[PDB]
Amino acid sequence: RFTCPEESEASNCSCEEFPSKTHFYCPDFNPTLYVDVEDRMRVDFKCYDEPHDFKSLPNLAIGSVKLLTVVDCVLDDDRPILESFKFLEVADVRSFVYNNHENGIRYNAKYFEGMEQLENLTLARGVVSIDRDTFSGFLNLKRLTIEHNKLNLQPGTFEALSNLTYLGLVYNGLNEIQPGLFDGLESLEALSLSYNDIKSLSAGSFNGLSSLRMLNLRVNKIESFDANTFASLKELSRLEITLNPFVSLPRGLFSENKKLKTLILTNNRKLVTLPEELLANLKELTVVNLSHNGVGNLPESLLSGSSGIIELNLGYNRLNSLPEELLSDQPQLQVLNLDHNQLESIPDYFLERNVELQTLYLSHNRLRSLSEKAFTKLKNLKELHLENNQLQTIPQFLFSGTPKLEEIYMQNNQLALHANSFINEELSIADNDNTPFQVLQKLRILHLRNNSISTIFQDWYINNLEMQSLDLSFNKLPGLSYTQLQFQSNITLNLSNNEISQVLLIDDLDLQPYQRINVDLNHNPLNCNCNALKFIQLIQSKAEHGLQFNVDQLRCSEPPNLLDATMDQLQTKDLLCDFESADDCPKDCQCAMRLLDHTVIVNCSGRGLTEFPDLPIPSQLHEDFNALEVHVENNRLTKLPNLTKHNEITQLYARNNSIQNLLPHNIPSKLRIIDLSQNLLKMIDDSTLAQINRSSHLETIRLSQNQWLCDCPASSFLIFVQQNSRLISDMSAIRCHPSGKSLDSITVNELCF
Amino acid sequence: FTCPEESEASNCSCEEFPSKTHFYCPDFNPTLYVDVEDRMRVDFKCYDEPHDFKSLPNLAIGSVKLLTVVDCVLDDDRPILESFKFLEVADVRSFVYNNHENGIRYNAKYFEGMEQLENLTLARGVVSIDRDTFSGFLNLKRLTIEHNKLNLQPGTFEALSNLTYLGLVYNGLNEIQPGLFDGLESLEALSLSYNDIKSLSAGSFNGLSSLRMLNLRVNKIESFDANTFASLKELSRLEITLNPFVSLPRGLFSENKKLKTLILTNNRKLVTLPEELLANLKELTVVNLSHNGVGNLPESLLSGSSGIIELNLGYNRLNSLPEELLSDQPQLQVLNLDHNQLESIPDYFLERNVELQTLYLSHNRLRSLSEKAFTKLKNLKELHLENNQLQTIPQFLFSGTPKLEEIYMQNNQLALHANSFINEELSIADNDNTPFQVLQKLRILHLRNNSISTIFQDWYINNLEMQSLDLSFNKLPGLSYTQLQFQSNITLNLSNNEISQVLLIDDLDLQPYQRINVDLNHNPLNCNCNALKFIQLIQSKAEHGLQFNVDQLRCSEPPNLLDATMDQLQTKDLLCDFESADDCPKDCQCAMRLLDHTVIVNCSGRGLTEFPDLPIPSQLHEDFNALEVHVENNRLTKLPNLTKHNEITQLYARNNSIQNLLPHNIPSKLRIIDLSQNLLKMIDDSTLAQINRSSHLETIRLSQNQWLCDCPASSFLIFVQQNSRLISDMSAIRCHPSGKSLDSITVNELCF
Ligand SMILES: *[C@@H]1O[C@H](CO)[C@@H](O[C@@H]2O[C@H](CO)[C@@H](O)[C@H](O)[C@H]2NC(C)=O)[C@H](O)[C@H]1NC(C)=O
Ligand SMILES: *[C@@H]1O[C@H](CO)[C@@H](O[C@@H]2O[C@H](CO)[C@@H](O)[C@H](O)[C@H]2NC(C)=O)[C@H](O)[C@H]1NC(C)=O
Ligand SMILES: *[C@@H]1O[C@H](CO)[C@@H](O[C@@H]2O[C@H](CO)[C@@H](O)[C@H](O)[C@H]2NC(C)=O)[C@H](O)[C@H]1NC(C)=O
Ligand SMILES: *[C@@H]1O[C@H](CO)[C@@H](O[C@@H]2O[C@H](CO)[C@@H](O)[C@H](O)[C@H]2NC(C)=O)[C@H](O)[C@H]1NC(C)=O
Ligand SMILES: *[C@@H]1O[C@H](CO)[C@@H](O)[C@H](O)[C@H]1NC(C)=O
Ligand SMILES: *[C@@H]1O[C@H](CO)[C@@H](O)[C@H](O)[C@H]1NC(C)=O
Ligand SMILES: *[C@@H]1O[C@H](CO)[C@@H](O)[C@H](O)[C@H]1NC(C)=O
Ligand SMILES: *[C@@H]1O[C@H](CO)[C@@H](O)[C@H](O)[C@H]1NC(C)=O
């Protein structure tokens, strides 16, 4: 265990012992450097300023340590690093990491006079002009990295490293690879040349490497190859060539890499063509990644014989008009990508040979219509993508041979799919439509966003039993009914941004006992007129029903009503229903009925007439409904509405009325609310008022703007007012015709005696 | 997610890994890379001139909570989002801006569009901040400014008023102006380390009320004010390290009742501590005073604080101690006094402390421990006494601590011996004074680098729970099997000792399957006959209980070549000089070997006609018996059996030539005789019978034989040849005195 050195005046370095790693700051006044030391795992030495004074240090005692990470600290000129770091006697060090920024250091064997048994090594930002003799003294060195330094390597610097395993030459900006730079690397298994400026790779560039398994040229400036560039790498298995600017690959580049397993060739822009049988006869090959290139057409024999492929990516090219038999020899192919390829159409027999194929991509192409035989023998297909195409429709037998299709994506298309699109030849054998989704019982997720869908097919809730999502946004849905909601699984049936004018529901919900059945209904020109009441009563009332509509953004589309109103702040009383089917309603009157309250409105208040308009009987059933509400406020010349007898009116409003000389014939059977404003109250008689009875329903009368004579012949009116005080809206406002003042003060004067 | 479609009229490309999608602009060379998560992060770093991202194609990436910029230059006045508009990210909840390129004078215009930002961080780029620069955020929880020289106005932070974590690290602040923290009501950390604050005024923390965990880890603080911390009623932690001040004001922490953790270390100039500095701190839990320069302490330093569970006082310059320094701390758990200059411990130091689990006293200069030092420690678990000057241990040192588990006594002047504790009072002739019998559960004990004489039997008798032990660099005289009586998986260590010899019983065994490890490396272990049992134990065996590590073992003054290895050990090399002066001649002693089981003189010497007669050195206690003859390649006067040859179990001669041999001269009591370079081939009466097949290794050899021809000896030669199978006669036999009389010669041939 390493503990802090005993405090003394000989040394000014302050050791702060932490539970994990003992810390240091040797110049106590100004800690220009700190030495974070673990027990025996690592040593972290970093300098912050120009002065070094390594000789004026307490001579720490660490002993054996695995990793020695020195950062941004100077080295003595042409002296061993362990000699320049004598103030800590690190020994038996395996890994050495040297970050250095201020000054580049020319390297020779004299800098490594203490690291004969070094396993790992790393250099960064500070190494320039490595000498050929630098690595001679090393024994059993397995890794080497030259990280972020501008460098130029003469051929032969690595000849002394026989046992080297991983070599990293990233970011060095090498201009070119001399033939024979890797002479001594006989046991090399991996190599990296990413982020360099290698102009070209000659035939003899990779001489001396035979057991190499991985290669890496991720970012270079390679303008051309040679036909025998990779011929010397018989053991190659992984190859990464990205972001290179070359125009084409030479014929037969991989003629000898029979052990190839993965080939990542992506973003190699300006790669317009691929040579004939580039990847032929590679049994071990399993993953091919040719995305983001600029290829315009693939040769037919590109993959002839490579039966071991399981993943083939070809996205983001300019690849159109695929050859028919390109994928004939790949029976293990699992994932195929063809997106962003500008494909106008694919050959009918393109995918017949692949009996097994899990996931297929065809998105972002320019497909117009899929062939019926495209998916005949894909018995293992699971995920299908067809988004962002120019599809008009789909053949009726398109999914006959893919019964295991879990998820499908058809968004951003021009699919029509009318209700009668797949109507049978008048057979009528099956109630469900003949849409191709009928055989897809395994379907789970379906997307149809941004389409021209104009219905919800019956097979989407009858045959598909495990459906759990059905996106139908931005397509021309005409309406919604309760039948189409008869799903048998938790489904988030999205229906936003459709032309859903109206929706119909029944008061009883047959939903199975489960969590919920969401229906997103945000932006629709919903008609808040008749036939929508039960939906409104459902949404506004709080209940534990399965249906959970999301109508927070939903508004109405009725100019007569409050347009742009929300249901959460909508008066359900104001729902109205026009009587368009009937023609016996009085002319020049707003004819409608409200189903919630069970009322029918005549609304002849707009016009003024000489007689009471004929009020049609509620011949329309309206669920066996027998009450009428009439507004006749403007008409004040009828002189009698005596047709009210043998009628079922329940509301009456006469803001302006003729002289109130009415007979008991006018007295109605079922009138709840009555208004007699702006009339001659003097003409009315007690016998008519006596026959008024609240037994049928509650009675409320209006005495506003009414003039009634007060005298002995007009007696008992005050008693009737007192009895009907609740009926009278303002009994005090009722006044004698000549006096114009309330008769309450003169109630004692009412009695003649 | 999906990279931009078709990459048309764009010089920047997408990688689209399954975890995150990278970007570069490699049209000529990729200067900058942008990699994004689904919604978590966006990292943006550029490595060249800013003109390379003047008009990049817009990425239109979804808004992500965390944004990062590295070494990217931006314009003088336009906001950050406007400069990086091509990213098209708006919902930012974390911003980090590393900028090594060029300092920029921040104005309030830079952060428009981030009115919901948190975890704002400005590293290495800020040079100066104008007032109300942070105004407008309206909700900020964490801020950090680091690695950049600064000089701030008092009213810079007034606008925030919701900040909880503030960090001004390595900013090179010359000093703290009063009221510079005025507007930070809800602050809860400062992290003012690595600055250059010269001193703290009384009003240096005016605007802070909900503060906790004030940090001053590295500063050039020269002095403190009396009421520096008075303005902070709530203050949980306080870290004040690596400062050049010489003393603290009296009553510095008077008003901070909530003080829970005071870390005050590495103040090399802090010569003394004020009295009752820690007074009346009930909530205090851990206090750290290590690595200071304090030389003396006041009596009332910790008065009125019973909540202390940890107290570190190590690496200081303490020379004396107060008596009641820990009177008011009955809840203490650990006490560190290591690396100080303490020469003694007060007798009444720890009567009132009972929850102490571990007590550290290493690297001090203690002369001895008082008997009642540990009298009241009912929960002591670990004890350290390393690098001290302890002479001996009192007999009742561990009387009051039965819970003790580990003990460390390295690098001490300990001189424990067999009679260092034995007293005639109540003597039981065993377990002298019981120095360690009171510790039942003593697991680990280190006595490395001491002057202990002998192993106390108490370690191997009643310390059943012992798991390890180390007696290296100690003056142990020897080892015996009786010392190995442990009842657990003990790993005893005796490396580099003065053990002359080990006496191990041949029938040593242990019933349990638990293993015992013993190391004798660098021990003299002189190799004599008694070491034969140790040699056998070291020899490879199928299974054993005492696994010996003897790779670096050496033999003291060896009879054989010096620095002999155990790989070259042999049974014959086990022979040792006998201690019986009368029994063996003074010229050379009897071998009396045990493994070899042979007795022979080491040197031939002058020689005698008759070998001396001595009793068997083994005396029936060993298989050892005389089997060899010292005389070799010498003209012996005679070889008589009565000259102890009969007493010798066997006879072995080397290049000894006898002209005449007789049956009387041949030893009958000896099982067999072996001779070489004999001058006579005649067969004696004893030679007429073949020596015993078993228990008689010595025999006759055809080689190095001289034939003698005589008619009477022909029958004896015939009898010898009948038993002989190597050859009819000697290979180098050329004798024919007018006839054939050799053993190969037939009966018909005669000597004449
Ligand atoms: C030299 O570096 C390599 C890679 O950095 C180290 O490899 C380790 O390998 C083991 C094998 O499973 C992994 O678990 C570790 O995570 C790897 N380490 C690292 C840092 O990636 C190797 O250990 C290093 N050699 C020494 C002596 O430290
Ligand atoms: C819905 O899909 C239509 C497809 O027409 C999108 O409208 C654009 O149509 C033109 C046709 O010439 C395409 O070139 C464009 O790419 C389409 N726009 C986009 C953004 O892809 C329309 O934008 C889509 N609506 C969405 C996705 O909300
Ligand atoms: C801003 O930083 C804070 C502090 O790191 C984050 O909050 C969490 O803080 C705790 C502190 O104990 C950490 O252990 C967590 O890891 C932090 N959360 C995360 C997600 O890292 C906070 O999340 C940060 N803000 C954002 C938007 O990431
Ligand atoms: C064993 O302990 C002794 C002392 O207990 C060590 O000797 C001391 O070494 C230091 C090293 O600077 C000197 O300052 C002291 O004066 C020495 N004291 C004595 C009494 O010699 C010794 O180094 C330790 N190790 C060994 C292997 O003996
Ligand atoms: C390589 O390893 C082998 C065996 O591990 C060893 O014999 C040889 O000396 C090593 N060479 C170098 C240069 O380390
Ligand atoms: C819907 O999800 C809930 C969640 O617990 C589950 O209990 C219920 O069974 C699901 N619906 C069906 C039809 O399984
Ligand atoms: C219908 O009723 C409303 C209610 O206020 C009234 O304003 C309107 O004039 C009526 N219309 C007709 C034609 O009577
Ligand atoms: C702190 O946050 C609250 C919560 O939104 C806000 O109202 C207040 O204005 C913020 N304080 C400042 C100074 O912006």
Side-chain angles (χ1 to χ4, degrees), chain B residues 150-152 154-157 159-165:
Chain B
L150 286 167
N151 264 357
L152 276 77
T156 57
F157 291 82
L160 290 161
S161 308
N162 280 335
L163 198 157
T164 67
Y165 173 80

Side-chain angles (χ1 to χ4, degrees), chain A residues 488-490 514:
Chain A
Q488 310 195 299
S489 164
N490 291 323
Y514 53 72

Side-chain angles (χ1 to χ4, degrees), chain A residues 589 591 601-607 631 633:
Chain A
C589 302
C591 198
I601 319 291
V602 174
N603 203 28
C604 284
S605 56
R607 300 295 303 176
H631 308 268
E633 68 89 19

Side-chain angles (χ1 to χ4, degrees), chain A residues 206-217 219-220:
Chain A
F206 289 127
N207 294 347
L209 310 167
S210 182
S211 171
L212 183 67
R213 292 216 295 240
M214 311 179 147
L215 191 57
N216 194 344
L217 317 177
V219 187
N220 291 63

